[PDB]
Design an enzyme around this catalytic site. Sequence first.
Site, PDB file in Angstrom:
ATOM      1  N   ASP A  17      -5.289  -5.043   7.848  1.00  0.00           N
ATOM      2  CA  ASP A  17      -4.835  -4.977   6.952  1.00  0.00           C
ATOM      3  C   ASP A  17      -6.408  -4.418   5.560  1.00  0.00           C
ATOM      4  OD1 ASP A  17      -3.157  -4.513   4.058  1.00  0.00           O
ATOM      5  OD2 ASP A  17      -2.508  -6.992   4.454  1.00  0.00           O
TER       6      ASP A  17
ATOM      7  N   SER B  57      -7.047  11.007  -4.510  1.00  0.00           N
ATOM      8  CA  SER B  57      -6.497  12.368  -4.144  1.00  0.00           C
ATOM      9  C   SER B  57      -6.906  13.136  -4.997  1.00  0.00           C
ATOM     10  CB  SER B  57      -5.117  12.001  -3.720  1.00  0.00           C
ATOM     11  OG  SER B  57      -4.618  14.135  -2.596  1.00  0.00           O
TER      12      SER B  57
HETATM   13  N1  D5V Z   1      -1.430  -4.493   2.023  1.00  0.00           N
HETATM   14  C1  D5V Z   1      -0.187  -5.232   2.334  1.00  0.00           C
HETATM   15  C2  D5V Z   1       0.329  -6.691   3.045  1.00  0.00           C
HETATM   16  O1  D5V Z   1      -0.027  -6.168   4.124  1.00  0.00           O
HETATM   17  C3  D5V Z   1       1.437  -6.625   3.365  1.00  0.00           C
HETATM   18  S1  D5V Z   1       1.861  -8.261   3.630  1.00  0.00           S
HETATM   19  C4  D5V Z   1       2.958  -7.909   5.186  1.00  0.00           C
HETATM   20  C5  D5V Z   1       4.440  -8.358   5.510  1.00  0.00           C
HETATM   21  C6  D5V Z   1       4.972  -7.879   6.691  1.00  0.00           C
HETATM   22  C7  D5V Z   1       4.657  -7.896   7.595  1.00  0.00           C
HETATM   23  C8  D5V Z   1       3.565  -6.932   7.292  1.00  0.00           C
HETATM   24  C9  D5V Z   1       2.254  -7.165   6.434  1.00  0.00           C
HETATM   25  C10 D5V Z   1       2.674  -6.590   2.232  1.00  0.00           C
HETATM   26  O2  D5V Z   1       3.091  -5.129   2.027  1.00  0.00           O
HETATM   27  C11 D5V Z   1       2.311  -4.340   1.971  1.00  0.00           C
HETATM   28  C12 D5V Z   1       1.430  -4.610   1.325  1.00  0.00           C
HETATM   29  O3  D5V Z   1       1.386  -6.493   1.111  1.00  0.00           O
END
Ligand code: D5V
Length: 330
Positions: A35, A199
């Site tokens: 992430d 962008s």
């Molecule tokens: N940075 C992102 C994070 O990874 C997710 S947490 C998440 C929740 C369910 C499934 C997978 C991840 C949340 O939605 C978008 C943003 O915050």
Amino acid sequence: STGSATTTPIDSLDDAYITPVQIGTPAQTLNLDFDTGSSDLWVFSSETTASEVDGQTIYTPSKSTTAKLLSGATWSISYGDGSSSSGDVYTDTVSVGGLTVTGQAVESAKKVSSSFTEDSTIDGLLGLAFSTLNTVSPTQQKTFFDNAKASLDSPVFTADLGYHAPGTYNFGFIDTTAYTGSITYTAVSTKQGFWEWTSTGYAVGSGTFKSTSIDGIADTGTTLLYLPATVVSAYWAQVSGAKSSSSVGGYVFPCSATLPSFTFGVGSARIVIPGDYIDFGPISTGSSSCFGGIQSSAGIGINIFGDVALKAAFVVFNGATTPTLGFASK
Ligand SMILES: N[C@H]1[C@H](O)[C@@H](Sc2ccccc2)[C@@H]2OC[C@H]1O2
């Protein structure tokens, strides 16, 4: 040093991507959601409330000879979608695709929200935004990338997400065989702790390019592409029958439609998102209404270049002293 790991869609829609990660000694392999929009490495564990675990693989620190409780440390995170998790903290050995970090903070969940429980394929998250966003208290902890950076051949990682197919996260090197043409680099602001960039504009299908600055974040943990309402309206206006549905929670379109591509600018370069990348399928099983992959960022407070955008590119996260972002077609 370098590392290279395959990342795999969790389902037929590319709702998220999971990457195997080795934690502890002997290794416990968990499939984590990498992430670039957050900065905590947290996992389902032997400490997670039993009723909140449903099919996930758990980390058991008591079975790891290199695990150490980080005394007094706790963490608690809430994500933009409403999801959350919290717990305590261990340090342990963590390896990704052959790249090893010793003493990595591994945040062990005691509680997770229903959305995580319901996702049996995701064993936790591995944050790759800047460590200033890490939620561990009272002593903030570093991300996996932050810890690895000095040891890497080059202080970079790359995201090469597949469309309905596996892809690759690389650490420490740029695979020049993985993209076409050149990589265009663009400035990053770390002021909010994100890989935040601007962008240079957009086009819809074969339409003319609109030069306009769109500030947003490169976020591998967000599924969709969230852009200003003006831009999103211009896109869906080109899809017959498409409309914003308050009951569904965004733009929907007839599943019989052929979607136009969406182009976004990176400096003078252009990344083209094919139309079918923007199809997220029936809103409910058997429906002929389909959910759109480009949605308004109004209400979020920030534009988000999520997987719909990033999977159309080879993306370089350059963690040099002045960070930058690179995009190439592929
Ligand atoms: N940075 C992102 C994070 O990874 C997710 S947490 C998440 C929740 C369910 C499934 C997978 C991840 C949340 O939605 C978008 C943003 O915050």
